[PDB]
């Protein structure tokens, strides 16, 4: 064989070049700065109304509204300041495992195992929430719908491919292929020019929304990656997988910067989200709880103690005021 | 504060709607249909009457949702937990493929998949309704194909009853959580319309068992 040898040798030289150019670890530089100590967080508000496992959530752009997807085929919009149910959207398919909120607040797209990403229009002259368009063309279970603007949304799916859509026309404008495993999450860059996605092949890949070429790839995880999000400046991102390790990568360093694992943790990570200042990384774990790590010291500076079931989703507001958490116990808790 | 009060009242009305919808959804039976693909699950879904398929049917004033998810073509580890809490798992195994192969024969693959589903972490209190397909075909085939082809440790005549009992016992033995849940085996019939009746009886048994467990008396 020839192709196998070429791929193996190319991997060899790129690995050697990346290893040789490593100067020092993140801790080696950032050890000097003082730590954060103990961070006390308490459930300011608690949200009731879901009657099944909550699989995903997404904060509004005004940092006051919420959206939650649960196994009972319900989509609720929460007034987080007053814990009021703004909207309740009966989904056509009850097998939802991800969904998000439009940056303009006009739309919500929410879908799952039925291989359909439904778009919902909130601001209707009819007074209710109607389905805008159903995006079809994925052959595997869906994950991490993410609006770019009012008329284009990028989604990942269990058929090893991500896609950029065009809600006006409904056809898959651009296709992102290359994953050798089910892609489980994707996070949009703050600039909405790039994004990253983690897959079940224990790899994360950086993709360009306009050209659709594989710009960069990241390794280091041993199991399937289920959570990922960008650093607030758009120059780094953290991944979480089932091997109970969170890792911070830099898009320009092209190699892992830091590991966020401890011996006590045995279960993997379900959700990952960052604080506004880019220092406090929140990670919701499989067992029952979330851990609030210092994104520079790799030290667990606080734990969110609630959620008598597995926590599935996290969200940090744009203004950074609070952190909303959703768990399989059908309860959303705001911590501030 | 008048607008806030009206918002709270609208929230309360929405919440009563969700409560009523939960009441409606709590009195319906959830079955997860599983098999090896070529196990004649199509005959089953026909007798009851891409991505995930729901089959809805009412029998004896009981509403049944059955989820056929065999066409996912994805790792089961990532989406099986979405069914943790179904009333029952309807498993289907063909009896004709004891000698037929897909390497190895298909019956051993079915046994492995059944062991994986039954001993799955997320299914501890979820009961299984087991169906055995191709009754007449299996009875006819053993007349010339000995069962020693599939199982070399078998010791019995090439009769329908002994082989069927041996297969049922072999499926039973893979279960190791015998004290919490059990396997409810049935042999499929064509014109009796008894598969639906057996499913109804098994789900009724499961419902009564959950009630007794909740009441603390059991």
């Amino acid at each position, epitope marked *: 064989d020839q192709l196998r040898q070429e791929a193996e040798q190319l991997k060899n030289q790129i690995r050697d070049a990346r290893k040789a150019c490593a100067d020092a670890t993140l801790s080696q530089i950032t050890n000097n700065i003082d730590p954060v100590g103990r961070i006390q967080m308490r459930t300011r508000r608690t949200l009731r109304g879901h009657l099944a496992k909550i699989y995903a959530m997404h904060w509004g752009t005004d940092s*006051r*509204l919420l959206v939650s997807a649960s196994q009972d085929g319900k989509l609720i919009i929460w*007034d987080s300041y*007053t814990t*009021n149910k*703004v*909207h309740a959207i009966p989904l056509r398919s009850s097998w939802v495992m991800t969904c998000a909120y439009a940056p303009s*607040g006009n739309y919500v797209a929410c879908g799952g195992l039925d291989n359909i990403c439904s778009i919902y229009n909130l*601001k209707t*002259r*009819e*007074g*209710n929430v109607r389905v805008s368009r159903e995006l079809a063309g994925h052959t595997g279970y869906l994950s991490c719908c993410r609006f770019l603007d009012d008329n284009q949304i990028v989604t990942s799916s269990g058929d090893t491919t991500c896609a950029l859509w065009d809600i006006e026309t409904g056809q898959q404008t651009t296709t992102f292929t290359g994953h050798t495993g089910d892609v489980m999450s994707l996070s949009l860059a703050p600039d909405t020019r790039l994004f990253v996605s983690g897959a079940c092949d224990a790899s994360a890949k950086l993709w360009d929304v306009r050209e659709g070429m594989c710009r960069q790839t990241f390794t280091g995880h041993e199991s399937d990656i289920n959570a990922i999000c960008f650093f607030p400046n758009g120059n780094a991102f953290a991944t979480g997988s089932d091997d109970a390790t969170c890792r911070l990568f830099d898009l320009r360093a092209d190699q892992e910067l830091m590991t966020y694992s401890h011996d006590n943790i045995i279960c993997g990570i379900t959700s990952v989200s960052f604080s506004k200042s880019g220092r406090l990384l929140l990670a919701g774990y499989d067992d029952f709880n979330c851990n609030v790590w210092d994104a520079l010291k790799a030290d667990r500076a606080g734990v969110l103690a609630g959620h008598d079931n597995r926590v599935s989703c996290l969200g940090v507001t744009d203004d950074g005021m609070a952190v909303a958490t959703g768990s399989w116990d059908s309860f959303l808790k705001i911590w501030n | *504060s*008048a*607008e*806030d*009060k*009206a*918002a709270v*009242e*609208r929230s*309360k*009305m929405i919440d009563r709607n969700l409560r009523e919808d939960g009441e409606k959804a709590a009195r319906e039976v959830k079955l997860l249909l599983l098999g090896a693909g070529e196990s004649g699950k199509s005959t089953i879904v026909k007798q009851m009457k891409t991505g995930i398929v729901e089959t809805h049917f009412t029998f004896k004033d009981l509403h049944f949702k059955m989820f056929d998810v065999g066409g996912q073509r994805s790792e089961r580890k990532k989406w099986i937990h979405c069914f943790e809490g179904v009333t029952a798992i309807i498993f289907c195994v063909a009896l004709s493929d004891y000698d037929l192969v897909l390497e190895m024969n298909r019956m051993h693959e079915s046994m492995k998949l059944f062991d994986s589903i039954c001993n799955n972490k997320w299914f501890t209190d979820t009961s299984i309704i087991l169906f055995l397909n191709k009754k007449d075909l299996f009875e006819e085939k053993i007349k010339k194909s000995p069962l020693t082809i599939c199982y070399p440790e078998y010791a019995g005549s090439n009769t329908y009853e002994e082989a069927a009992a041996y297969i049922q016992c072999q499926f039973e033995d893979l279960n190791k959580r015998k004290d919490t849940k059990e396997i409810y085996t049935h042999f499929t019939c064509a014109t009796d319309t008894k598969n639906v009746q057996f499913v109804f009886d098994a789900v009724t048994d499961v419902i009564i068992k959950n009630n007794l467990k909740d009441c603390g008396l059991f």
Partner: single-chain antibody
Amino acid sequence: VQLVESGGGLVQPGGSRKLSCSASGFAFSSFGMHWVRQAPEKGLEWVAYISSGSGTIYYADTVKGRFTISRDDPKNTLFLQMTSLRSEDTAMYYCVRSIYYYGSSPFDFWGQGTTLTVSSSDIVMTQATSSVPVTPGESVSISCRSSKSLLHSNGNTYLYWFLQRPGQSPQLLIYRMSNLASGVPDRFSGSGSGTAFTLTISRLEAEDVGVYYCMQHLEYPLTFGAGTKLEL
């Protein structure tokens, strides 16, 4: 969206009539409904309000105990029942919808209304003038003042600006200070503080003439302004 009213006409005093409002084109069961009235060239005056599902019911001080507000959600129709009618009840009645949640425009659509003629604490808002001439292309500033400070502790002040063109029904323009309604041109803008409220129009056109009204919610009952008429 279309709200159609019926039941008006000429009635002897002390008699009884019933006003019906037929809704067709929106989710009626999720919208609270107001009955508002406008006397002949006097001004708008709130009459009644019934919430979604008839959970909450509010009446005006001047009429409480004489009218009956009714809802038929199955049929998407609104009712207003009248027992005793004086000479002050002669007015055009408008059936208005209102939905309340975080960010809604709770006076979006006004019905066309019907006329009813009869044979012969509260926050007060005042507008300074009643006739302002202006040429199109000239910016126009209007203002009104209230007694109480409508700025609630929530952070938003509950002030509403409506426009009524000659021969037409009112159109919602502003619902707090600067949040424009849906389908309204950008040229309108509003601001103010506490009690003093101003509405500015840049590059006015001939179709922007009519009578402007400023109203407060903040509390029930709802009170309107005097109404200022522009001329051209």
